[PDB]
RNA sequence: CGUGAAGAGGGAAACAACCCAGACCGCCAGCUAAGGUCCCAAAGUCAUGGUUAAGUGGGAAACGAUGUGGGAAGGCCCAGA
RNA sequence: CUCCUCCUAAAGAGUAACGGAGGAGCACGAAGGUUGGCUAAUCCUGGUCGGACAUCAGGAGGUUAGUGCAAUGGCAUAAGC
RNA sequence: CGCUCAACGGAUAAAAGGUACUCCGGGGAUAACAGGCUGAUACCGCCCAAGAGUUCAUAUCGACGGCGGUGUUUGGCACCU
RNA sequence: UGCCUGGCGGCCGUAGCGCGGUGGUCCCACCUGACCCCAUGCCGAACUCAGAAGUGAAACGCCGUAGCGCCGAUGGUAGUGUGGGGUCUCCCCAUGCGAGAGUAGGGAACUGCCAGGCAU
């Protein structure tokens, strides 16, 4: 039942990623299968609240990007070194 | 392993010959047969060759694995090399002792005309 | 062919030697000096090296 | 008090003297080294202190060759 | 008081302490005390905090120390002017933000929080209470 | 690496070495830099939206506290919190 | 207090301190040349005296050995035997 | 071929001390006093609370450790003379 | 033309280990003898010579198989040249360069010259 709304990233790299996290979003990547990887931006507060549930890391999530729905599983998460924040997430296509 | 031991034995002289840019006369010996190749300095092209597994050479020998066969192969490889107009090679014993069949082949090649 | 105008906007006092050499290669002599140069990747690289102290009119 | 340290030896000015692509004359030293960090390739010699030097005029070339991924220096005739 | 049983060398350059920590996850227990600040932790401090923690939990559960004081610190005695490096006097661990310093298991979370607060009161660096995460 | 030394001018109250900037001479012309625009003292008592009530601004730590502004959640609640 | 090796030394060279650590003031007519050959430590198992460790045999292992003497860089085509 | 000329670019073939009886040329390039910078040390506060206090951590002391203030001892430096 | 084998190279783990299977007409290997050429600091073990009864057992080659080794993105993170800034022991902003590790995944090599055997 986990649904996450995402945007396609229009800029990549250190500066753009830091600007995202200063604007209270964070970057993430969807890869796997035969499709090309998709780099996305997520809303930090909503996703941070969702990932508190243990089922976030075991269930099949749905990421809505540009209207299309993609079934994924959380694969890796980079956390802030000491704040309760998220830096990045890997999603693998399910 | 005997083969690995012999390859280790042969490596130093082969590397020296490659550094010198010489045309090699490489000998290979087995209990039943003996083989000779003349190899270009690049190490990957064979100019002439002769062995006891060739019918034209083996038909004139009682046994292909002795000193008489070695001498026949040496003479044949030297004659073919001279026909191609080579005349100047370096002997590569390939880790076999310079002795017996290998030496008989080398002596036959020298007598037939190869300079080494 | 196409040319661009480059003006020096800040002083050269105390800049790195490579930066002073780049200003020399652009032909810039003083604050407010404007020069006209051919638009090539080499010229663009010189501008990039000293971009904090020059301005470009295209 | 005092210290039991305080010693050192003079710097030996080792290293690469001619880099890849440089045109050299025969005899030129290409690298000074302790032992063979670099190995002698075509038209290069290895001296008694393992100095690699040009045996012909040409351009310096570095490459990695062989089963041990070793580094060789050769001279390309120009 | 932790200290290496033996070392290659007696004295170490001062160095610096930049960067973020490695070892930022609760890896052995369920709860952790994590550094938020940057600094040095002396062996005496590590041991004072360990004592405070252990007495708070009444020697129940299990406690891990994730840091070890492997850097020797020298001092020059009083009224000395040069003349060689001073004498090793104590040992420290370098701490960067994010470093998990202690972990606990086998106790309730409220008790672990209390014990860790008592411990943090012994340390020269700001800290925060963390819990194990599944990923 | 930069400046002083061997470098004046403007700023940082005053302050070789910081910031801006390199004084050939004259002008009772003009534009700017750093830094500034209530009076001393040249220029906004300028405009719009907020925050602070401590003269904080205009000296400092672990740590303490219903100071006050903002944000995302959570528990209970007209079946009465 | 001269000489050698490492680090400091900021991935070319060089780079200071009464900075951090170690060595030299020789040895060898073979321990030098060359040709031919060869490959280590350690452990396990079995075996007279013989035992934790002698020599023998097999296996594992793969240079964890070796290098006339410090340390570094090298060394199987061995520079090791 | 002859030098531990080892103070190792080697003053001579050949060399130790005292001066409070002292003297000259110099230096605040360099010590002793006082100032300055610093604040390890010193002194004075504070935080946590093991415990002592019949019970009771906080009447009164406060162990293991943590954070500051002063310029105030012992010192460091060598900036002024 | 294809298959198999031997020799010399290119390349230097996507190519190496392990595990399982498989090959003897030829080739290779083990193999059979040794008075002799030659040899053992003893030993025909090795080296060497003279051979061809036997066997593919070992070795070797080939085939299969991810249990390993090995290779390996995208994204993010670390660092950093230049310019600017802060609460300056450490960091942030603009711009440029951008890892290592880890993840998805790949992966049981490919190839040149000459010679021989078989089929064709
Ligand atoms: K100047
Ligand atoms: K005030
Ligand atoms: K109130
Ligand atoms: K260095
Ligand atoms: K010898
Ligand atoms: K002297
Ligand atoms: K005297
Ligand atoms: K006297
Ligand atoms: K103080
Ligand atoms: K002070
Ligand atoms: K106080
Ligand atoms: K009481
Ligand atoms: K005086
Ligand atoms: K493989
Ligand atoms: Mg940046
Ligand atoms: Mg300036
Ligand atoms: Mg050195
Ligand atoms: Mg450093
Ligand atoms: Mg580190
Ligand atoms: Mg002067
Ligand atoms: Mg000035
Ligand atoms: Mg001034
Ligand atoms: Mg001021
Ligand atoms: Mg003034
Ligand atoms: Mg104006
Ligand atoms: Mg006015
Ligand atoms: Mg107004
Ligand atoms: Mg004030
Ligand atoms: Mg260097
Ligand atoms: Mg450098
Ligand atoms: Mg210098
Ligand atoms: Mg100097
Ligand atoms: Mg020195
Ligand atoms: Mg000594
Ligand atoms: Mg040899
Ligand atoms: Mg001298
Ligand atoms: Mg008297
Ligand atoms: Mg006098
Ligand atoms: Mg004077
Ligand atoms: Mg002075
Ligand atoms: Mg005194
Ligand atoms: Mg004084
Ligand atoms: Mg009290
Ligand atoms: Mg106390
Ligand atoms: Mg005073
Ligand atoms: Mg004083
Ligand atoms: Mg001084
Ligand atoms: Mg004075
Ligand atoms: Mg004065
Ligand atoms: Mg035999
Ligand atoms: Mg078999
Ligand atoms: Mg990347
Ligand atoms: Mg990578
Ligand atoms: Mg295989």
Swiss-Prot record, chain A:
GO molecular function, one term: 5S rRNA binding
Listed GO biological process terms: cytoplasmic translation; negative regulation of translation; response to radiation; ribosomal large subunit assembly; translation
GO terms under cellular component: cytoplasm; cytosol; cytosolic large ribosomal subunit
Entry superkingdom: Bacteria
Record keywords: Ribonucleoprotein, Ribosomal protein, RNA-binding, rRNA-binding
Pfam families listed in its UniProt record: Ribosomal_L25p
UniProt cross-references to PANTHER family, sorted A to Z: RIBOSOMAL PROTEIN L25/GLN-TRNA SYNTHETASE, ANTI-CODON-BINDING DOMAIN-CONTAINING PROTEIN (PTHR33284), RIBOSOMAL PROTEIN L25_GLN-TRNA SYNTHETASE, ANTI-CODON-BINDING DOMAIN-CONTAINING PROTEIN (PTHR33284:SF1)
Summary of subunit composition and partner proteins: Part of the 50S ribosomal subunit; part of the 5S rRNA/L5/L18/L25 subcomplex. Contacts the 5S rRNA.
Similarity remark: Belongs to the bacterial ribosomal protein bL25 family.
Protein purpose: This is one of the proteins that binds to the 5S RNA in the ribosome where it forms part of the central protuberance. Binds to the 5S rRNA independently of L5 and L18. Not required for binding of the 5S rRNA/L5/L18 subcomplex to 23S rRNA.
Protein name: Large ribosomal subunit protein bL25
UniProtKB/Swiss-Prot annotation, chain C:
Top-level taxon of the source organism: Bacteria
CDD domains referenced in this protein's UniProt entry, alphabetically: Ribosomal_L30
Annotated GO biological process: cytoplasmic translation; ribosomal large subunit assembly
Gene Ontology terms for molecular function: structural constituent of ribosome
Entry-linked Gene3D superfamilies: Ribosomal protein L30, ferredoxin-like fold domain
A Gene Ontology cellular-component term: cytoplasm
InterPro entries according to UniProt: Ribo_uL30_ferredoxin-like_sf, Ribosomal_uL30_bac-type, Ribosomal_uL30_CS, Ribosomal_uL30_ferredoxin-like
UniProt KW keywords: Ribonucleoprotein, Ribosomal protein
Miscellaneous comment: This protein is located near the guanosine triphosphatase center of the 50S subunit.
Family that this chain belongs to: Belongs to the universal ribosomal protein uL30 family.
Database matches in HAMAP family: Ribosomal_uL30_B
NCBIfam families per UniProt: rpmD_bact
Quaternary structure and partners: Part of the 50S ribosomal subunit.
Protein name: Large ribosomal subunit protein uL30
From Swiss-Prot, chain D:
InterPro entries, alphabetized: Ribosomal_bL27 (IPR001684), Ribosomal_bL27_CS (IPR018261)
Residues covered by region (Disordered): 1-13
PANTHER family documented for this protein: LARGE RIBOSOMAL SUBUNIT PROTEIN BL27M, RIBOSOMAL PROTEIN L27
Keyword Ligase belongs to the record: no
Superkingdom of the source species: Bacteria
This protein's record includes keyword rRNA-binding: yes
The protein's name: Large ribosomal subunit protein bL27
Subunit composition and interactions: Part of the 50S ribosomal subunit. Cross-links to the 23S rRNA. Cross-links to the A and P site tRNAs.
A GO biological process held by the record: cytosolic ribosome assembly
Disulfide bonds: none
A molecular function (GO) term: tRNA binding
Name of the encoding gene: rpmA
Keywords noted in UniProt: Ribonucleoprotein, Ribosomal protein, RNA-binding, rRNA-binding, tRNA-binding
GO cellular-component term (any): cytoplasm
Family: Belongs to the bacterial ribosomal protein bL27 family.
């Amino acid at each position: 039942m986990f649904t996450i709304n995402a945007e396609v990233r229009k800029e990549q790299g250190k500066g753009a990623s830091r600007r995202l996290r200063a604007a209270n979003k964070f970057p993430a990547i969807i890869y796997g299968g035969k499709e090309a990887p998709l780099a996305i931006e997520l809303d930090h507060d909503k996703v941070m609240n969702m990932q508190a549930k243990a089922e976030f890391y075991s269930e099949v999530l749905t990421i809505v990007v540009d209207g299309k729905e993609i079934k994924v599983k959380a694969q890796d998460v980079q956390r802030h070194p000491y704040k309760p924040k998220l830096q990045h997430i890997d999603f693998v296509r399910a | 392993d005997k083969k690995s031991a012999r390859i280790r034995r042969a490596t130093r002289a082969r590397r020296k010959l490659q550094e010198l840019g010489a045309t090699r006369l490489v000998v290979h010996r087995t209990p039943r047969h003996i083989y000779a190749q003349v190899i270009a300095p690049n190490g990957s092209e064979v100019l002439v060759a002769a062995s006891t597994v060739e019918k034209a050479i083996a038909e004139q020998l009682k046994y292909t694995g002795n000193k008489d066969a070695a001498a026949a192969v040496g003479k044949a490889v030297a004659e073919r090399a001279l026909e191609k107009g080579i005349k100047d090679v370096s002997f590569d014993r390939s880790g076999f002792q310079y002795h017996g069949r290998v030496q008989a082949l080398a002596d036959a090649a020298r007598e037939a005309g190869l300079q080494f | 062919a196409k040319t661009i105008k480059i003006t020096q906007t800040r002083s050269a006092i105390g800049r790195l030697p490579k930066h002073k050499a780049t200003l020399l290669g652009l032909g810039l002599r003083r604050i407010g000096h404007t020069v006209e140069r051919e638009d090539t990747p080499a010229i663009r690289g010189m501008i990039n090296a000293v971009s904090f102290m020059v301005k470009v009119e295209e | 008090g005092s210290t039991r340290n305080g010693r050192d030896s003079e710097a030996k000015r080792l290293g690469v003297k001619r880099f890849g692509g440089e045109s050299v004359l025969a005899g030129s030293i290409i690298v000074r080294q302790r032992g063979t960090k670099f190995h002698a390739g075509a038209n290069v010699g290895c001296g008694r202190d393992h100095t690699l030097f040009a045996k012909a005029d040409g351009k310096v070339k570095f490459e990695v060759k062989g089963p041990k991924n070793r580094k060789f220096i050769s001279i390309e005739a120009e | 008081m932790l200290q290496p049983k033996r070392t290659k060398f007696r004295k170490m350059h001062k160095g610096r302490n930049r960067g973020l920590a490695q070892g930022t996850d609760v890896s052995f227990g369920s709860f952790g005390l994590k550094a938020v600040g940057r600094g040095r932790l002396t062996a005496r401090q590590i041991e004072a905090a360990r004592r405070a923690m252990t007495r708070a939990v009444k020697r129940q559960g299990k406690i891990w120390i994730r840091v070890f004081p492997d850097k020797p610190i020298t001092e020059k005695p009083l009224a000395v002017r040069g003349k060689g490096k001073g004498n090793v006097e104590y040992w420290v661990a370098l701490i960067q933000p994010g470093k998990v310093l202690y972990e606990m298991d086998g106790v309730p979370e409220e008790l672990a929080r209390e014990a860790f607060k008592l411990a943090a009161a012994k340390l020269p660096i700001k800290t925060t209470f963390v819990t194990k995460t599944v990923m």
